[model samples]
Target: AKVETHEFTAEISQLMSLIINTVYSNKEIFLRELISNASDALDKIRYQALSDPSQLESEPELFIRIIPQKDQKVLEIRDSGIGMTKADLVNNLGTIAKSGTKSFMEALSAGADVSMIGQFGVGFYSLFLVADHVQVISKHNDDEQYVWESNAGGKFTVTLDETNERLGRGTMLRLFLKEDQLEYLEEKRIKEVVKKHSEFVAYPIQLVVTKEV
Candidate 1:
């Protein structure tokens, strides 16, 4: 797929760092982010499923899976919502210029109730809170499978998705959690995180427990 790039002013970069550093505490926020993203995916399908009625190939249920692997040293959150094409990945994952979020932040103080997540549309940046390195594998129904990946900061990479085509559409956020924070590696801890924040999500959120061979 074709790709594009984004530019940032000094103020913009500073704003990103400030919020990412300050607002991204309370790991509970991850649950909120995931639940929100899942709702969005399901919402898209809900509309499409209504018009065509066939998109509900499966029962129109959204999924949130939490998998913990000791040997791989990874924690992954998977969702069955609107997935991205290679270009969608670039536009969605690459650019800091999302839909008018920077302007909204101007109205927010540093101490606003972080739980009250306004749709500044900058939540994707929350990935930095847990994992320094991130990669998303997605298959939009309109396009081929693709991958968008990045490190803890600016600069990222993308590639043609050669993954399977079984999924309808959605994003899988693989959080390679940082070391020393293994406290996040527990199932009960993750469930509490979800129950606290995402219990209100419109779709079901389930956790996946994985064991290494």
Candidate 2:
């Protein structure tokens, strides 16, 4: 399929701006939010597997991997979980506060401390705090692998993964960190963040280490 571009709804655009600039005080929470998301995805597949075990046949072990590439300035969070379909990417990431958009806007105008918006489920946007661009490649059992790319702008693009590289069944998020945000590329820093926020996550969160052979 050809690349399809979609604009974030006006409310979502505003919400993204708030999330990137003011909503989160501690920038490290971006890792927490993403890990939390990956955990949820794994939970979904596990729940689904209760009825049909085939989902686990290919990727029997469910886990999250944090791969930091210092040279490329990219941090990758990958999970063997219930990956999203194309429509899921659009609905889940393209929009914010699906049913409560009106109330969120009202609260925003009423001078309410928008920090509570995080509880309303806009955690994914927190990545923009450190990343200048983000790409999500996901493969679901029911759909083809699709790649979603955005630069925290008003628009994002989704396209089929035409290349031979396949995820099998999972999602991998690649964050192109901002120059000042290169601290995240350090393994020690990431381990510290994970310990503080996601130490108790149900699945194992491993940091990929590449040893020179």
Candidate 3:
């Protein structure tokens, strides 16, 4: 398909302000949730390979890697897992072509628990809790590498990534940290969170730490 851009489904757009500004009891848990999501993708590909092992040939590395950039204030979490297609990007991110915005909000407004909201297809948006912008670079064995990006303002854009080095088959989540969210750039903090929240992850978790001079 040609370069595709979309506004977040009305329901999600309406909730963006609240999600970004409203403080959750455990805001740090966003990393936990995202890591789990990555693990799930790995499990999916591993299962698929059980029958048709060739899928593993596309990307044999099955692990998660976190790279922190203090100068740029960005945190990247990457996984060698079942990546996404253009359609998958839209459907999973904020929301897209949803059936009804009004009804969706009514349900959420009626005392919906914030902690469990991710399960309802709004999980990926959790990055907005800490980042001013989020960029997802994913490559699927079946399709070209693509980039999906948004600021959680109301819209997002997705396009083919022809110039960048390909990812083979996986997903990379790049969080452009908000000013106050810069603590994520510290290796100590990332290590603590990963150990406390994602240590049990089935796949190996690697850290691309800063190389000292």
The model with the greatest lDDT is 2
Task: Name every residue pair that clashes in candidate 3.
Answer: none
TM-score of each: 0.80, 0.88, 0.87
State the lDDT of candidate 3 residue by residue for 142-173, as single tens digits: 88789998977788899888765678899999
How big is the positional error of residue 75 in model 1, measured in Å on the Cα after superposition?
1.9
Candidate 1 residues lying further than 4 Å off, grouped into runs, are 1-16, 23-25, 58-61, 93-100, 108-111, 116-118, 163-168, 211-213
Which regions of candidate 2 fall more than 4 Å away from where they truly are? 93-96, 100-118, 211-213
RMSD of each: 3.5, 2.8, 3.0
Relative to the true structure, candidate 3 reaches a TM of 0.87
Alpha-carbon lDDT of model 3: 0.78
- Model 1, position 209, has a per-residue lDDT of 67
* True lDDT of residue 125, candidate 3: 59
How far out, in Å, is residue 183 in model 3?
A: 0.7
Candidate 2 lDDT over 1-213, as tens digits, reads 699998877777876676667644568888888888899889999999999999877578899999997777899999999999999887755344564554565776887554434565666667888887999999999999999998877998999998736878899999999898899988789999999978899999889865523
lDDT tens digits, residues 1-213, model 1?
Answer: 543334444444544566557644575575577668767877887788778776666435567667776566667666777677777666654344444356446645665544444356566555556666767777677786677766635555677756534455677776677775565568888888787777777767777766535
